[PDB]
Amino acid sequence: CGKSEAPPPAQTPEVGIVTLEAQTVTLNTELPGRTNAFRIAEVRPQVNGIILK
């Protein structure tokens, strides 16, 4: 008639303690853009006439 079920306690192990200290780090930032030629010349004529060749 009842009078049972003794509760045991727990220990809860396996905690991952990791410490941290100050440091010196450099900061960067990504910026989007395009690539362009170093020098590009569009060939344009300076006379009048028919392209023969």
């Binding site: 910026l31 989007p32 853009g33 395009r34």
Partner: protein
Amino acid sequence: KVNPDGSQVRLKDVADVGLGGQDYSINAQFNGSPASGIAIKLATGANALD
């Protein structure tokens, strides 16, 4: 808005985003302490004791 040369405007330059309340009309407190809760009514035809 993004231009073809890469310049752009994101949704942190015109606004500030955060998790807030859906409605700010009604607010409760309990003995001065900040509190919220749900008020429960009863469907008609059902017993209020069970």
